[PDB]
């Protein structure tokens, strides 16, 4: 009775969604921008080299003023650097060594740490008594934390490996919205430059798009052969890019619901540990397992500049707010700055 | 600093002193001995941690014979294992705890697939993975008393329809031990220990101590030729 009608309605809706997805993809990006002149070679080179880490680097994040950095490693350290003079600004000890993500508030006041202990800890910088102390320990998840980002000084987004996502308020400590609907473990989420939307990828060859105040999931995204490790977000808010573990990076649209572009080369048979964009959106920056980062033309996917210089796997990379530099953090303990 | 402002000198001083502290901390954080613990549920991991006196990951620490031992118990997690184990490739040893008594009990709808099938599948998955082709494996065998008191009244072929031996304890114990130690695919690099637990076995961690000593000598006696 009710069950049969529900199954029939679900099948009909799935067929309609598949038909819409098939019809929407009239042409690909590579077929439209054949008249755009190539960027040529980009012989980027090292300007600084930060030292002092001992085990691998898991996460790095920029600041809003394009000058300071933060990075987290196995040893138990979260370190805030001054890029111009290659100096320490802050050093932060931890209690859980198995960190996987970093956050740095757009007001220069708070940072965040998270990983393999289910708790997202939030740290206050601009103190009075002279030490970056601990304020809040957000709990409520049952699996390892993948990534966390700040909305403002009193709103945060977290995701773990339980198929769930959380919108949280620092002041009270109580979760405000739970997002469910994933099958596999969730690996990452990116924000939007209006704090109203966000997108996540899960270890089930899918990525979904969610509204931030309603609590619902408005879109679902398929097309990969294995799990997605890293995802980031296009600055204008009408596309995003994901990185799988089957040697292919993808560019989707948050408004067309279809696989749009793919990046992969035959000589590359390894994974994509991190993907980032740049300020103008004309470069895609990818960290691989072949020990070197590639720089794809993020709009034609027909070429790649190359950045080498690491003795191990690349795990994270970032780009300044103003576009001045790009930073790579890898498994050899060294963090490097290109301009 | 003739070309430095009056205030960047203190900045350089701060950065240098933080580098000193990092270096000292990361030098003192390479002298404690790592260990990674594993075992199927209800297989005696609680007994192992209780006898030797030591959610997400649960870490635990103890001090013996002037060495600080650090055991990572990771059984509280139920997520996929492809993701949180490659951060464990620097450990000396993998402790693997199982029990000999559960040779009959069925954990699912398939009566042939008892608990030992799952334990040996986990063992084979761990031994033949990429991030542990140089890692010693310590196999703790538990529950001997109930095993004898069961096989006095029940056969063994219920889970081994190829066994042709005596139905006393010793032959069963030898057969189980060889059945565990014969799945290794490269005996030129790895090694597989075994020790039989008992409720008064105050030597429960002495076995681990000896295994780690031998692993370290194997490393130091290979990196210098010989």
């Amino acid at each position: 009775s009710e069950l049969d009608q529900l199954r029939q309605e679900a099948e009909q809706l799935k067929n309609q969604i598949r038909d819409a997805r098939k019809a929407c993809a009239d042409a690909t990006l590579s077929q439209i921008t054949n008249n755009i002149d190539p960027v040529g070679r980009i012989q980027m080179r090292t300007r600084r080299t930060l030292r002092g880490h001992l085990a691998k680097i898991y996460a790095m994040h920029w600041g809003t003023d394009s000058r300071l950095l933060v990075s987290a490693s196995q040893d138990g350290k979260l370190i805030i650097w001054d890029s111009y003079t290659t100096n320490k600004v802050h050093a932060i000890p931890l209690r859980s060594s198995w960190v996987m993500t970093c956050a740095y508030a757009p007001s220069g006041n708070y940072v965040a740490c998270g990983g393999l202990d289910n708790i997202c800890s939030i740290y206050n910088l601009k103190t009075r008594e002279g030490n970056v102390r601990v304020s809040r320990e957000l709990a409520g998840h049952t699996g390892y934390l993948s990534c966390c980002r700040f909305l403002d000084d009193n709103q945060i987004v977290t995701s773990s490996g339980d198929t769930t996502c959380a919108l949280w308020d620092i002041e009270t400590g109580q979760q405000t919205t739970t997002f469910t609907g994933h099958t596999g473990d969730v690996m990452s989420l990116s924000l939007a430059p209006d704090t109203r939307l966000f997108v996540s990828g899960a270890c089930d060859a899918s990525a979904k798009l969610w509204d931030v105040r309603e609590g619902m999931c408005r879109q679902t995204f398929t097309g990969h052969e294995s799990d997605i490790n890293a995802i980031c977000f296009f600055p204008n808010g009408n596309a995003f890019a994901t990185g799988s573990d089957d040697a292919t990076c993808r560019l989707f649209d948050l408004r067309a619901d279809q696989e749009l572009m793919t990046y992969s080369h035959d000589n590359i048979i390894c994974g994509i540990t991190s993907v980032s964009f740049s300020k103008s959106g004309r470069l895609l920056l990818a960290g691989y397992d072949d020990f070197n980062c590639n720089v794809w033309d993020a709009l034609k996917a027909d070429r790649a500049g190359v950045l080498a210089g690491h003795d191990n796997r690349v795990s994270c990379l970032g780009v300044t707010d103003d576009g001045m530099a790009v930073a790579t953090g890898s498994w050899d303990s060294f963090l490097k700055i290109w301009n | 600093g003739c070309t430095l402002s009056a205030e960047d000198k203190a900045a350089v001083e701060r950065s240098k002193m933080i580098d000193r502290n990092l270096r000292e901390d990361g030098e003192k954080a390479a002298r404690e001995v790592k260990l990674l613990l594993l075992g199927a549920g209800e297989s005696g991991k609680n007994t192992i941690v209780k006898q030797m006196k030591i959610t997400g990951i649960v870490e635990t620490h103890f001090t013996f014979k002037d060495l600080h031992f650090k055991m990572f118990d990771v059984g509280a997690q139920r997520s996929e294992r492809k993701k949180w184990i490659h951060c464990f490739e620097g450990v000396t040893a993998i402790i693997f705890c199982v029990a000999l008594s559960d040779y009959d009990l069925v954990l699912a709808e398939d009566e042939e697939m008892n608990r030992m099938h799952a334990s040996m599948k986990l063992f084979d998955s761990i031994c033949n993975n990429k991030w542990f082709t140089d890692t010693s494996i310590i196999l703790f065998l538990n529950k001997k008393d109930l095993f004898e008191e069961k096989i006095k009244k029940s056969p063994l072929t219920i889970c081994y329809p190829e066994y042709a031996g005596s139905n006393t304890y010793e032959e069963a114990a030898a057969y189980i031990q060889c059945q565990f130690e014969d799945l290794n695919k490269r005996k030129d690099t790895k090694e597989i220990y075994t020790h039989f637990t008992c409720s008064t076995d105050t030597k429960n961690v002495q076995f681990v101590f000896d295994a780690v000593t031998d692993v370290i000598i194997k490393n130091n006696l290979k990196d210098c030729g010989l």
Partner: single-chain antibody
Amino acid sequence: VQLVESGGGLVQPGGSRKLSCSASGFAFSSFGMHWVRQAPEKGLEWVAYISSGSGTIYYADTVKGRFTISRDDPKNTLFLQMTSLRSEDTAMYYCVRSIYYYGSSPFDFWGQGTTLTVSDIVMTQATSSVPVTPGESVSISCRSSKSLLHSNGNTYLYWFLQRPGQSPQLLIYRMSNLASGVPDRFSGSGSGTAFTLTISRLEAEDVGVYYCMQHLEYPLTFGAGTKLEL
């Protein structure tokens, strides 16, 4: 955050005495420390500076061989030691903290000071007294004998206030920024050797003495300070 100073008094020329500063409420060992002094009837003048790790020490010109600064970290304490005094050395002393890293705001918090009695680039302050009224806008200005704009964009000028019976309190660091606990009516700006501070909508407990200071290169030099009286 509390900085309590002790050890002052009245001594005859010569002799020796040690002025101590006890800190409570903050991480002692991440801040560098300064000692400053004020004349019984006139302005301020830098004295000494000690830094983190006991690495660097700077004195002024009229002080060497006589003064010794040190810090004792475990008890969170700072020491100045003084010997062979003269009648020119009667003043009152303040212990100031400052932490140098990018974005910081040095000279943030000042102590109460202690009275001691005994039986180059210079700052020119435009005026000695200017009358005021509660409700009009006011400006003050001073000038420096050499340019203070370094090569990195910094413009090292510090603006301080002192109300009657009180201790100094920061108002402006690096020519454009507000310290902690100060209303947003205060403002300031500058140019090539001519520096201005602006107060709008005057009030009570806003009358007293104003000072300007440089920190481009040691030794540090004050000026004579102007007065708004009402």
